[PDB]
Amino acid sequence: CQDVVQDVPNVDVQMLELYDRMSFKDIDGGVWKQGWNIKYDPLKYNAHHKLKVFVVPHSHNDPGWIQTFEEYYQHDTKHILSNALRHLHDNPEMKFIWAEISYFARFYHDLGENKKLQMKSIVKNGQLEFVTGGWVMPDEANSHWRNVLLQLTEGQTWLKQFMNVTPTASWAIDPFGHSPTMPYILQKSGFKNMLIQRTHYSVKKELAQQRQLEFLWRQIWDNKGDTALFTHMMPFYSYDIPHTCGPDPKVCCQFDFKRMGSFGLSCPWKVPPRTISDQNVAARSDLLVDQWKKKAELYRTNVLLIPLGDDFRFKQNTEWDVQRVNYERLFEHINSQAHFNVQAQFGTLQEYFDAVHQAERAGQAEFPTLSGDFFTYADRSDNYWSGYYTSRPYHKRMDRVLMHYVRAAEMLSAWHSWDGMARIEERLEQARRELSLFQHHDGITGTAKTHVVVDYEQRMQEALKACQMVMQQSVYRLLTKPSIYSPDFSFSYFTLDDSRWPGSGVEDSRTTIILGEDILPSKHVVMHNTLPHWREQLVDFYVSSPFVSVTDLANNPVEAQVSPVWSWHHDTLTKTIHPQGSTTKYRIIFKARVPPMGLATYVLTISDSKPEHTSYASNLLLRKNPTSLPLGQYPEDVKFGDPREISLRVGNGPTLAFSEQGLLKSIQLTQDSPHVPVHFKFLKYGVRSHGDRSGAYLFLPNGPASPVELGQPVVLVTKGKLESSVSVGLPSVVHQTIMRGGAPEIRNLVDIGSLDNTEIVMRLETHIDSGDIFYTDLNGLQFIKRRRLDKLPLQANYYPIPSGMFIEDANTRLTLLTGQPLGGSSLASGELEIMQDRRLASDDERGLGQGVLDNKPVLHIYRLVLEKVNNCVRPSKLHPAGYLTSAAHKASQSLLDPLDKFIFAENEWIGAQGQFGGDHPSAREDLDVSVMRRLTKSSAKTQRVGYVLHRTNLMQCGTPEEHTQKLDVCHLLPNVARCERTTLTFLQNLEHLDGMVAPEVCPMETAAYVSSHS
Ligand SMILES: *[C@@H]1O[C@H](CO)[C@@H](O)[C@H](O)[C@H]1NC(C)=O
């Protein structure tokens, strides 16, 4: 295994280093506005060394943006694909590349058998080529690597089954900034090449000048370079035709033959395209070839890529003709005019890359190595696209919830083979596809029109229900005596109970377990643990009585705590935000212990009086002019008082101190240690009254944030033996700090209401001497070092915070883990800040056609980990990466993959069992079974189950961390006949494993295995 901590990789280009040196001056470079006047030696090419040009026709189809997926399909895409089939069929030399499989699958299944055959033939012969082959072209900032893999797998699995092809070249022309998580996944999925486009205009200029636009992209910690994937970065402002033929859009626009008038399109540079004729072909070619040769100067080989397309292009037959015919005339002339020394033709992406590597092998070019990412993107001036790191936060959070539900549903149902009548495969396919769809660069990004966002939400809602159905059916089968098991595949044996989604104050959705002497004395509940190690976690349920006790299936009592059900309300009368307690519903909390990838059953029983093993939390409402707060049967009376600072400590965990406004002020790790200053504060950013305005994509603040006026907020303090908390009703946010014995959990019920042109940020202020350094994660896969650059505007220093961020000095580190992707930064030494929501009245001119005024209450969740790191073995000062500690990693897992909770629906569960998976191996803490998916239906003689294993890297800080079993996923199911290592998509077998044993992976490595069972 490579050491991912102590060996600083030696690369030609390291993005953090490059950023440190670059000046980012935005000067007018001429026709190529953000570059310079490219010059070339005409004698460079000749009869013995020609420029090979590949014109690659394409059509960018968004699975939703300003129209829904179905609206686009009906109005544009089905016509684009229908005419592509016809035109390619009739013109053997014409080529076309396709990226979005969600659309292709929709189209193909609607085609008649005759057409399906014609389609398969033009793919087999190389005319129609799939690039990437994912369900969508995913966002690369907010997306979790697990979902990036899910959607890629969904698309490629379809392609393998119906088109008999697996793309090895990736095409990503629209994501707003690019992440190394892509080559990581692609390189481990059989890919050999990838192309990207949206990178900072300053980076394009810098790399172009050094001819480093094509490079071997390796991971920041990869010293050997085995993760390297050849990458081609386009050099210009856009992927449209005016910005793909060469440096001058005024000239290139003249070669987009769909802009002559009848199509309602034109050239903004005032020079329209002209139909090619024998009369003007020589002059037209001279102009075009000149653009090509200038573009060619930015690269190292004699093979040139020239994309030919735009949004939803190649729809009308007339369009296919006008583009094909005119280009055929140009090719015939150019290729027959020796003085040009050029050979041009229509080609595919793979054809381009094959030629490039042929030139490389011929020894005509050597490519530079590179590590780092391409965030934060800016397409011009100071317009940095850090706004979408936060836009539509409700759905960003929903993404993480569904991500987990999909994993849990696939894993729970993978243990058994199911009869087709159970509709298991059906529901899981729907769930995977709706989640995959949302990974689109206009989905999770929060950059779609209001009604499209609604469509995505509806789709995810159906996916969640599908997951629940599969999960509950699975639990019933796994925990019921076999000879008693009698399933009704349409029946709900269990109801999922989720305390954090949609969340309290967002939607009263969770059911109350109703118990009573005259109706029902007890109720069974079951917890599921998708993680491959034994896990304990507090779980809570709503009950109709405070007099409830918990026991496991062995009838062993389990210590529990009951607390009231508090709901915050904006009192329109008193103009105050205060909590009201329920007099009929209560929360019971207890510690559940679940086997690795297993289940554990408990029983809740009601009694006439306070049970022996159940304690009751005290409650203190701090505020002036208080009013009574009755709580029905609740044992203890609420106490009141004027606002004041308070301190709390649960178990032997840390001691937290709060201000009289209910905000964190300090953290004391141990009774000995000091009170480390850690202050939470809420501020607000505005919008500029002059110039460019912030929108769904752009973050253009009118200066540093201003503190939110808090007034005299109402603070609620709940103190319990197992869980305590401090909640405060602030303007736009009910802020809550929950303690259970370890790092606190933070929950924000964010309702920006009608505060137009406002962006709410949550900031942490400390004494940590971090300087200008901070760390953020990329797709929940790795942590990359960031350097605040004062030479860049505030918005440029904002980065994606998909799952976590941290700052540290020689001795102390503060890590904030998230349960949803949001935007954030460290604008000053010792600070961390992350945006909660943003409401913008104006459009930011990128095509959306609207601002963001559809905000809705969302419950954001976090874990705040303060730790001493002076004893940790960390990377040298020059290493571009950072790594989490065991505590921080486990805290992240508690947010993204918590225990699942099931409530038995009927009055009695006959044949109930108390546990499943007690014999499952408990793997080392840095290892996870990211995916467990049965790949075969019940009719298959040889069953196959696929596993994706990921091992992260945790810092060694002196903790022994011992006794853990080796995890061999190939033996998780009985009767294993073979074990094979496969690509992450499970589509290609890479190794036949002896002894049928799947070995664990190295730190920061991800592998996939498929076990076959007879
Ligand atoms: C799939 O493509 C491969 C090319 O390697 C070919 O050998 C095989 O026969 C094809 N299978 C079909 C008919 O889909």
Ligand SMILES: O[C@H]1[C@H]2[C@H](O)CCCN2C[C@H]1O
């Ligand atoms: O995705 C749509 C849009 C993005 O939302 C912002 C950049 C320009 N893009 C072109 C469209 O495909």
Ligand SMILES: [Zn+2]
């Ligand atoms: Zn797009």
